[PDB]
Amino acid sequence: AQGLLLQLLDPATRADPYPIYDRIRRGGPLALPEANLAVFSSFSDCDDVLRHPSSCSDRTKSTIFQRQLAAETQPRPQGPASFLFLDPPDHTRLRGLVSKAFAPRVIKRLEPEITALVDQLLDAVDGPEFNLIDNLAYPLPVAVICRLLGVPIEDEPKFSRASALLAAALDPFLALTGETSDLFDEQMKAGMWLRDYLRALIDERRRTPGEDLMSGLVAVEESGDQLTEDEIIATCNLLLIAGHETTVNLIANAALAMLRTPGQWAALAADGSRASAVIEETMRYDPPVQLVSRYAGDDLTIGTHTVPKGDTMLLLLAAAHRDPTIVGAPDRFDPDRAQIRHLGFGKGAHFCLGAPLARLEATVALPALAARFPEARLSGEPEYKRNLTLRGMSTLSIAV
């Protein structure tokens, strides 16, 4: 159990973790009460945990979180990045406010901007080989999130640094190794800098509001107690990291899969309407978010496996998506299959509010990319980041 998880953590396996994921799933649920940890990997088990009324997202109920806090020799810096309690009503209230701005029909209005952005980025692409990450996959969703949150493009390099650091902090290193990350100090600093910057931006938007989402949230904060400044900072932290470290991998993973599967790139190049099917199959086959976690709010049962109160439950979504009880030929990338209702955007009370935006960004980017370069070929094996949870490529080289 410990061995297989350590192989999964090993950066050398990031390029292809799926043989390990399948091996973990076939081995069944991993019960590790000694490390306050349970690991689920089948579709049934992951679904059940995401559904369970006792499953908590709040860190206060985590035993590992309580142990980590007790061992620390200094107070954590002020801000939601270190700590913010939210009861179920707080969470529902925040989702309600954010969901209106991220509704598919509101997000749809960003298509012209996204289309012009995709066209300009592709116009800038030079042969004989280019890095898809640098040229399209990364800068597109970054430009969209910066404009949506009203963040100045001049400060983007600093927002890029903080998002990369905080996206890596979501790796369950403490739950799996027993010790904290080697980037812990930098992640703390990035959290501090973001807090101070967003606090300064919030104040500026009080005096001089814009048409951005941050300015919209400030107006709600200013109109009544329905929203606090800390809640705005927490929300904007989440959105900013989502904008930098998620869609990039949906776009890039899909491009990679099409290049690795004979005829798939050509098919999309000849028929743009295949975009949606390619995207959903990428969400299943090579998910941008590889895993999620929940904490047992009380003693609970998943199937026949009991989880003690306070323990962390890691859900290996990448493994769940290749479960032979839910999908035929699970380890094959096939956009022409009868698609499953995958867990790539989560589900229930915590379902991804950015799903419409992510889908829209990819739906514009991918078919334009294939149509622009129908002759495209993967020139070499891709280069991956250390990230396990928000897993992605730093280099995806395409020959043109």
- Binding residues, as ranges, are 91, 95, 294, 350, 352
Q: Rounded to an integer, what distance in angstroms lies between the CA atom of residue 384 and that of residue 16?
A: 10
Of 211, 146, 219, 161, residue with least CA distance to 191: 161
Q: Are strands 37-40 and 312-315 parallel, antiparallel or unpaired?
A: parallel
Q: Are strands 292-296 and 129-131 parallel, antiparallel or unpaired?
A: unpaired
Instruction: From 4-12, 94-102, 124-132, 148-156, give the range in contact with ligand ECL by CB under 6 A.
Output: 94-102
Q: Which residues contact 220 (CB under 8 A, 6 or more apart)?
A: 97, 226, 227
Count how many Cα atoms sit within 13 Å of the Cα of residue 215 in the half-sphere of its side chain: 13
Site for ligand HEM in 32-91 (CB under 6 A): none
Least separation in angstroms between residue 236's CB and ligand HEM is 10
Element (H, E) at 262: none
315 lies in the binding site for ligand ECL (CB under 6 A): no
243 lies in the binding site for ligand HEM (CB under 6 A): yes
Of 390, 387, 398, 397, residue with least CA distance to 14: 387
Q: Which residues contact 57 (CB under 8 A, 6 or more apart)?
A: 91, 294, 295, 350
Instruction: From 32-40, 201-209, 320-328, 347-355, give the range in contact with ligand HEM by CB under 6 A.
Output: 347-355
57 lies in the binding site for ligand ECL (CB under 6 A): yes
Site for ligand ECL in 251-290 (CB under 6 A): 289
Closer to ligand ECL by CB, 194 or 259: give it: 194
243 lies in the binding site for ligand ECL (CB under 6 A): no
170 lies in the binding site for ligand ECL (CB under 6 A): yes
Using CA of residue 242, residue 244, residue 249, residue 251, what is the dihedral sign?
positive
Structural contact between residues 147 and 109, judged by C-beta atoms closer than 8 angstroms: no
Q: Which does 344 bind (CB under 5 to 8 A by kind): ligand HEM, Na ion, ligand ECL, none?
A: ligand HEM
Of 136, 129, 139, residue with least CA distance to 398: 129
Beta bridge partners of 37: 32, 312
Least separation in angstroms between residue 169's CB and ligand ECL is 7
Per the annotation, binding residues for heme b are: 91, 95, 294, 350, 352
Closer to ligand ECL by CB, 264 or 282: give it: 282
Inter-CA distances, 247 with 201, 353, 355, 358, Å: 25, 13, 9, 5
Member of 146, 174, 292, 318 binding ligand HEM (CB under 6 A): 292
Contact string 82-101 vs ligand HEM (x = CB under 6 A):
-------------x--x---
Least separation in angstroms between residue 102's CB and ligand HEM is 6
Q: Within its chain, how far is the Cα of 166 from the centroid?
A: 12
> Could you list the residues that contact ligand HEM (CB under 6 A)?
95, 98, 145, 238-239, 242-243, 246-247, 250, 288-289, 292, 344-346, 350, 352-354, 357-358
Q: Which residues bind ligand ECL (CB under 6 A)?
A: 57-58, 80-81, 84, 86, 91, 94-95, 98, 166, 170, 191, 234-235, 237-238, 241-242, 246, 289, 292, 352-354, 389
> Which residues lie near Na ion (CB under 5 A)?
57, 350
